[PDB]
Amino acid sequence: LILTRLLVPPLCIRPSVVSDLKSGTNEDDLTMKLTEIIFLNDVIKKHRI
Amino acid sequence: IVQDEILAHRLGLIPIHADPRLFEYRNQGDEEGTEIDTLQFRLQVRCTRN
Amino acid sequence: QPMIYICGECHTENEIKSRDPIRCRECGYRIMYKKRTKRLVVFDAR
Amino acid sequence: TVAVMSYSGYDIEDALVLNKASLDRGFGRCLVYKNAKCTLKRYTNQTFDKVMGPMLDAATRKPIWRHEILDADGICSPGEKVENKQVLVNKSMPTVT
Amino acid sequence: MIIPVRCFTCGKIVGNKWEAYLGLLQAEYTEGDALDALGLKRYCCRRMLLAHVDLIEKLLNYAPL
Amino acid sequence: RCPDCGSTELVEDSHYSQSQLVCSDCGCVVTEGVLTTTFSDEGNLREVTYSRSTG
Amino acid sequence: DYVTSGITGEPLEAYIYFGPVYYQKLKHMVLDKMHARARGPRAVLTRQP
Ligand SMILES: [Zn+2]
Ligand SMILES: [Zn+2]
Ligand SMILES: [Zn+2]
């Protein structure tokens, strides 16, 4: 029940829509939150060091 | 200002004095037409101020 | 090649090159149409 | 000129038959007009959307079928007929901006 | 817009009779007697001539010219 | 290219609302079907720019 | 009015009601409403039309 690891799901669930009309890719909020989680873990490591 | 389709339809509705007994049905295709199967009417009108 | 057009309300025969600001000679209009095609077009009486 | 009667049983529920001659003679003839509009922008970079001319086929020295209706400037000319999938504006965008 | 060439029901030539019709209404003539003068026995031709609206002139007033 | 004949004359043509690649020489299809974003989804998803992404 | 059938050429038993009436055509036409769907495209997230 206590979660200490996170299963990131396959790229099938998370779309990456490269908007050809612009220089960008529409991305799921889940991928952004995964990026934020990785950043948080790394900055926690940095602050511990 | 009259659209081309309406103009063509109105031109089609116009009767002709040609005797139909002297001609034959145009065959399938042959859109050029021959002497027997078709006639031609050329209409050119230009509107200018007096 | 002369690429020609027609203006908004005086119908002046305005050949303009590309990138030119849209102006009517003998006027100052800035709305402008294209002339009709020269190619033959077949219509059906139906 | 409507006639109130039953005919051919093809007018069961609110259906109503027409006269083929009347339709041929322009009765009920209608026209549908649709607009097609495109924009050519100049971006923050000093570059702009540009329209190429018709794609002249090398084999025939003539525009390809998909580009048949386009004029020299790359824009379809009024008066010509248009079929499905054919191009009306040969618009091209700068990929950088 | 413009007067149709043929009557919808019968198909009699009615396009040519329109112009002179306005001439008849140009004078004192009423509608019914004008239609009688033009020779429209059945009422479909009379309907087509009577109910027509000459929008073509109003549109031509907006034509480029 | 054509897997069998090797002809590189693959052309894109629009079918009855289907995007596919077919070889003009042997009429054999090399790739069919395309995946595009729907408006109901394009309205919800948010676009990202390179600057905010890199920080 | 007394009306003869076009098909049979015989007079109709019952009198028919002729008259000019105002018909207005509607925007809803079959040419725009007809639709057929082959395999066609699918959506990235849920693979449905
Ligand atoms: Zn002008
Ligand atoms: Zn009539
Ligand atoms: Zn092949």
Coordinates of all heavy atoms in Angstrom, one line a residue, chain E residues 3 14-15 17-19 21 35 38 40 44-53:
Chain E
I3 N -36.4 36.2 -66.0 CA -37.6 35.4 -66.4 C -37.3 34.1 -66.9 O -36.4 34.0 -67.7 CB -38.5 36.2 -67.4 CG1 -39.9 35.6 -67.5 CG2 -37.8 36.4 -68.7 CD1 -40.7 35.7 -66.3
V14 N -42.4 31.6 -72.7 CA -42.9 32.7 -71.9 C -41.9 33.7 -71.8 O -42.1 34.9 -71.4 CB -43.5 32.2 -70.6 CG1 -42.3 31.7 -69.7 CG2 -44.2 33.3 -69.9
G15 N -40.6 33.4 -72.1 CA -39.5 34.3 -71.9 C -39.6 35.5 -72.7 O -39.4 36.6 -72.3
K17 N -42.3 36.9 -74.1 CA -43.5 37.7 -73.8 C -43.4 38.6 -72.6 O -44.2 39.4 -72.4 CB -44.7 36.7 -73.6 CG -45.2 36.1 -74.9 CD -46.0 34.8 -74.6 CE -46.5 34.1 -75.8 NZ -45.6 34.4 -77.0
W18 N -42.3 38.4 -71.8 CA -42.1 39.2 -70.6 C -41.9 40.7 -70.9 O -42.6 41.5 -70.4 CB -41.0 38.7 -69.8 CG -40.4 39.7 -68.9 CD1 -39.2 40.4 -69.1 CD2 -40.9 40.1 -67.6 NE1 -39.0 41.3 -68.0 CE2 -40.0 41.1 -67.1 CE3 -42.0 39.8 -66.9 CZ2 -40.2 41.7 -65.9 CZ3 -42.2 40.4 -65.6 CH2 -41.3 41.4 -65.2
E19 N -41.0 41.0 -71.8 CA -40.6 42.4 -72.1 C -41.8 43.2 -72.6 O -42.2 44.2 -71.9 CB -39.5 42.4 -73.1 CG -39.2 43.8 -73.6 CD -38.7 44.7 -72.4 OE1 -38.1 44.1 -71.4 OE2 -38.9 45.9 -72.5
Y21 N -44.8 42.5 -72.1 CA -45.7 42.6 -71.0 C -45.5 43.8 -70.1 O -46.4 44.6 -69.8 CB -45.5 41.3 -70.1 CG -46.1 41.4 -68.7 CD1 -47.5 41.2 -68.5 CD2 -45.3 41.7 -67.6 CE1 -48.0 41.3 -67.3 CE2 -45.9 41.8 -66.3 CZ -47.2 41.6 -66.2 OH -47.8 41.7 -64.9
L35 N -52.4 40.1 -69.8 CA -52.2 38.7 -70.0 C -53.1 38.1 -71.2 O -52.6 37.3 -72.0 CB -52.5 37.9 -68.7 CG -51.5 38.3 -67.6 CD1 -51.8 37.4 -66.4 CD2 -50.1 38.2 -68.0
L38 N -51.5 39.2 -74.4 CA -50.3 38.3 -74.7 C -50.7 36.9 -75.2 O -49.9 36.3 -75.8 CB -49.4 38.2 -73.5 CG -48.6 39.5 -73.2 CD1 -47.8 39.4 -71.9 CD2 -47.6 39.7 -74.4
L40 N -52.3 34.2 -73.0 CA -52.1 33.2 -72.0 C -53.4 32.6 -71.5 O -54.0 33.1 -70.5 CB -51.2 33.8 -70.9 CG -49.9 34.3 -71.2 CD1 -49.0 34.5 -70.0 CD2 -49.2 33.4 -72.2
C44 N -51.2 28.7 -65.7 CA -49.8 28.5 -65.3 C -48.9 29.6 -65.9 O -48.0 30.1 -65.2 CB -49.3 27.1 -65.7 SG -48.9 26.9 -67.5
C45 N -49.1 29.8 -67.2 CA -48.3 30.9 -67.8 C -48.6 32.2 -67.2 O -47.7 33.1 -67.0 CB -48.6 30.9 -69.3 SG -48.2 29.4 -70.2
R46 N -49.9 32.5 -66.9 CA -50.2 33.7 -66.2 C -49.6 33.8 -64.9 O -49.2 34.9 -64.5 CB -51.8 33.8 -66.1 CG -52.5 33.7 -67.4 CD -54.0 33.4 -67.2 NE -54.6 34.4 -66.3 CZ -55.2 35.5 -66.6 NH1 -55.3 35.9 -67.8 NH2 -55.7 36.2 -65.6
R47 N -49.5 32.7 -64.2 CA -48.8 32.7 -62.9 C -47.4 33.0 -63.0 O -46.8 33.9 -62.3 CB -49.0 31.3 -62.2 CG -48.0 31.0 -61.2 CD -48.1 29.6 -60.7 NE -47.8 28.6 -61.8 CZ -46.6 28.1 -62.1 NH1 -45.5 28.5 -61.4 NH2 -46.6 27.3 -63.1
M48 N -46.7 32.4 -64.0 CA -45.3 32.6 -64.1 C -45.0 34.1 -64.5 O -44.1 34.7 -63.9 CB -44.7 31.7 -65.2 CG -43.2 31.7 -65.2 SD -42.5 30.5 -64.0 CE -43.3 29.0 -64.5
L49 N -45.7 34.6 -65.4 CA -45.5 36.0 -65.8 C -45.9 36.9 -64.6 O -45.1 37.9 -64.4 CB -46.4 36.4 -67.0 CG -45.6 36.3 -68.3 CD1 -46.4 36.9 -69.5 CD2 -44.3 36.9 -68.2
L50 N -46.9 36.7 -63.9 CA -47.4 37.6 -62.8 C -46.5 37.5 -61.6 O -46.1 38.6 -61.1 CB -48.8 37.2 -62.4 CG -49.5 38.1 -61.4 CD1 -49.2 39.5 -61.7 CD2 -51.0 37.8 -61.3
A51 N -46.1 36.3 -61.2 CA -45.4 36.1 -59.9 C -43.9 36.5 -60.1 O -43.2 36.5 -59.1 CB -45.5 34.7 -59.4
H52 N -43.4 36.7 -61.3 CA -42.0 36.9 -61.5 C -41.5 38.2 -60.8 O -42.2 39.2 -60.8 CB -41.6 36.9 -63.0 CG -40.2 37.3 -63.2 ND1 -39.1 36.6 -62.7 CD2 -39.6 38.3 -64.0 CE1 -38.0 37.1 -63.1 NE2 -38.3 38.1 -63.9
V53 N -40.3 38.2 -60.3 CA -39.6 39.4 -59.8 C -38.4 39.6 -60.6 O -37.5 38.7 -60.7 CB -39.3 39.3 -58.3 CG1 -40.6 39.4 -57.5 CG2 -38.7 38.0 -58.0

